[PDB]
Symmetry: D2
Subunit: 291 residues, 4 copies
Amino acid sequence: VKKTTQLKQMLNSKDLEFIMEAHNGLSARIVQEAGFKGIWGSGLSVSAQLGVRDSNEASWTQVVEVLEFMSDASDVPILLDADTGYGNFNNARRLVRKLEDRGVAGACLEDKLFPKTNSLHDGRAQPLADIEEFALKIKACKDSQTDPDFCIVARVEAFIAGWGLDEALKRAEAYRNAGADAILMHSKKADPSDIEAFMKAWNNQGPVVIVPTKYYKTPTDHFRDMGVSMVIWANHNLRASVSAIQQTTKQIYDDQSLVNVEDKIVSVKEIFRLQRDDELVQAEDKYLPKN
Amino acid sequence: VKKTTQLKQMLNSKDLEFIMEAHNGLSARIVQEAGFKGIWGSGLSVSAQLGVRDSNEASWTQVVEVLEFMSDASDVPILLDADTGYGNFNNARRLVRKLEDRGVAGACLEDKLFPKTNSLHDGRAQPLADIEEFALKIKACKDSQTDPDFCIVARVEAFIAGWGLDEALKRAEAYRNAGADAILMHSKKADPSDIEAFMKAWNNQGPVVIVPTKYYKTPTDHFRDMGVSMVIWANHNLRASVSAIQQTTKQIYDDQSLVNVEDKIVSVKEIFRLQRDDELVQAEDKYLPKN
Amino acid sequence: VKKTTQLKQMLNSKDLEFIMEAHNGLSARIVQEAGFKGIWGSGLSVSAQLGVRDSNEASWTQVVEVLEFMSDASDVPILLDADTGYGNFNNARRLVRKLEDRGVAGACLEDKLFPKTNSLHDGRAQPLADIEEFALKIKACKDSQTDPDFCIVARVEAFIAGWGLDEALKRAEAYRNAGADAILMHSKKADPSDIEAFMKAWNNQGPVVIVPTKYYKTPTDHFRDMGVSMVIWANHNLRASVSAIQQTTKQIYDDQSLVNVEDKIVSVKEIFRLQRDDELVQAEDKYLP
Amino acid sequence: VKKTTQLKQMLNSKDLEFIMEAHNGLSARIVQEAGFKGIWGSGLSVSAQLGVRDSNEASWTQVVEVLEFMSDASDVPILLDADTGYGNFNNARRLVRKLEDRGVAGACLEDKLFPKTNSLHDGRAQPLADIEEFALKIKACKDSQTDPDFCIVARVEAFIAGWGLDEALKRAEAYRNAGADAILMHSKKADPSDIEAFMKAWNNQGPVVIVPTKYYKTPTDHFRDMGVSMVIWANHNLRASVSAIQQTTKQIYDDQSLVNVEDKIVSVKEIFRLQRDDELVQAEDKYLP
Ligand SMILES: O=C([O-])C(=O)[O-]
Ligand SMILES: O=C([O-])C(=O)[O-]
Ligand SMILES: O=C([O-])C(=O)[O-]
Ligand SMILES: O=C([O-])C(=O)[O-]
Ligand SMILES: [Mg+2]
Ligand SMILES: [Mg+2]
Ligand SMILES: [Mg+2]
Ligand SMILES: [Mg+2]
């Protein structure tokens, strides 16, 4: 069934669902083959892989293109981390159109200003979007959809910006009232206190998504206990990939030889396998003169 | 000094030089920080990361764009693996122009047909380009350069295609006579016999580059002994990166928790560090109203 | 209604249908407003507007992005002139999937080699693709489409390459048998004799498309009499735009004033209307708090 | 000679210089052939030709790729109309580095918010950027260029936004002090009174650029008398091209024939000449074995 429908069911299941980050077509295929039911198109990981910062440096179409290759390499839905929507309601609704066309399942937008600053920094400025304004941006995206199953997740940055539960709840309520398919409540505390607080006051008004990067020590069953609908593992493949490349590059640099890595890395045939080279081999058998 | 000049010196040093593969801006930065003096813009790794095959599926401008992000993230030269030049002499000379503009240091072109098939496959067809034709393609690229230090490496695929030393030498001689900055002699044997054979007959007519992926057991000092000018570690960061992502994704998938990977992967701050987030922090200090 | 279907109906209709060249989003929208039921995404015109040659210099993705903007600005189908398919069957089938996703209604592939040379050149070598290979490339595109109505037009360049009816017919038959939704029979003659001979020998095996650029004085009812399914007006909007820009630029350059061009060009409000600025105005009243 | 230098000489010259709007590689090459010494990479015209609005819908990289093709097709400098810089100082400085790499000679940034609205609209809100912030954005672009001759033009939208000379002058002075190579003072009046008043109060602090679109009946020598350094013909080639396409399409649509357009548009050989096909012919004799 449609990737959009797959993601919507997930956001709406009372069951706790999990999406894993991917940041390129290769990693999207890997996450798929692992069994994950959804993919998180991480804004940080996509910017990082390109070698730029997570501050809207690469253009929205450069992001979308990375996402197109990812969509093509995967059968499970991708929820794009669309930052603040790359501009106003009009830039956001144009983004949704391009997203739908590429097979991307949903877009997550955070209530800050363009260009944004990664939520994980401390001390940095985290100005928030006006509430009525942001809600209308959420509504324009929903209003503008062609496929009714496409998802719009509204990310509340109130705790991240030093505001309280009061603000967090007003904005979550507003975004939900504007048609958001789920609310992503964010927090950068090493514990889940902001989340516990929010979930308690929310009174299960709608599905809630969380990103436990900072409070990763919290047992997952606690999230189930709170009634969270989905958890996003945000940037670990990007992070694992950097450890590997630094370790590998240093070893080859030091040895001036491949002997100490050849057996610690996937083979060339595994690469060809993940690129689905065999399919092409079938196709050439069928579409090229035998002689 | 120019990245082009840096690469040219390397190809011309009698000293054995080493370039390491990178396939995105993040990995190009990592290879740089490791001490490598050059980067191999692997056609396989760039296609693989995008989730496609190494058969000219992504367009040449999609490849060039990945390469632009890589160039921007690095101070050392990048030698692009330009497949067969993405078409005829005209498609190749247009490519050189775009390459020079992006700060890419050189392009390597192999003597096969567009679209190509990865040299590492066995049994697959590996038709070779006509010799006079290919040589003229090499000359048009050199002829068409603006920066005289830009490098054109001619990759001979004769051994790869099942031909002998005789063919390999005629084509190497032709490509060198056409102005190539070095000849990349290829082989997929688990030993360096084709290379030993070629080096013996070449009589050090010009610089020779090799890719020891398949005969990786050969001691590097043997290459020095043969008078090889450069060695290319072709696809190991891509390969290390896939092992890491598969391992990481499987662990999180199984645990439904981050506990068993958080300490096995680079931190978020290391990510911010490789994106040079601090530079931006300086810049905002300088270009944004304090209040 | 659906673009691929609209284009497939036109190729299959008994009546002579017409599509007009557009080369950017603006020209596609003008073509639609004029009433044309389809657009020819001219390779010559897309390459020319970019300032490059009709020699596969711009990549296939740069062509596809121009086409995406064109598709976004129109409701009628666009038939892309996809040269030789930008490489082999695999390059063609990847292109078909991207075109379907961007809303393009079909692709037209010609039986020459990558990179190609424009058909209108006199004396330029026009090496033809092997018949079997090209027919397998057509079948590949057909086998790979996900919209059953997406069309694939196979263009025969035999007459263009200096060959005869024999070659042209063998080629057209192979491609049709491969599954082409229509055959584009090409000729650079100032008369329609190559087309007449082909139409006679064809026995109406399937829909035929033609491009009267060089034999334009031929009365259009004659094409109808021949059973021709579609005519393409191939590069006239591009050519008209160059005349217009060349004139306006010269005028302003000479006068160092706009007084003599201001009354001869459309108003800025017309540009806004063509850009659909009123739709933004309506969205802004809903969504700008 | 070098494009950035050529553009910097024009801004600094005492004489009234002129640049003409181009919106794609083809129009840039025509503009150059006409003799113009520089090109205005119009935001309105680039967006319009794509079929989208002048509201930062196309991304900044899509605009930059149109500009790259334009730059590749011309020897004279292009001044890009870069709207508000496509975001904050960081988005502007990244854009400057890409423009330098693609051969673009300079950027023109206006003191409004991202995403912007075209200045010519009547009644549309035109919220201005904070003076200090915008001045720091200009300084950032200046601090970040690697070619010292690359130009940065700061556009003052005060009059456009409904403000007075006071606001317009404070803004122009801040930006100039920030390092702008020239100030573009804008007005949508049918007369040049806003420009006259500004020029009087300016005391020739630095080069001023103007865009006479709405006050075009003003005699050009009057701008010279005012000490104006450069005039931009902002959207006339785009507007001329729409008139031409609209006419040609209608004609062909009505006639279902090319006989009445064939004699009114440039030849296919002219398109080849503009594409520089003869250069390919010369390369093919050297390099095609
Ligand atoms: O960018 C990301 O991964 C995020 O915001 O979670
Ligand atoms: O693509 C590659 O890495 C190669 O050819 O070595
Ligand atoms: O490019 C074109 O317009 C053609 O081939 O007809
Ligand atoms: O977009 C344009 O042409 C302008 O602002 O002048
Ligand atoms: Mg993010
Ligand atoms: Mg390769
Ligand atoms: Mg064509
Ligand atoms: Mg503008």
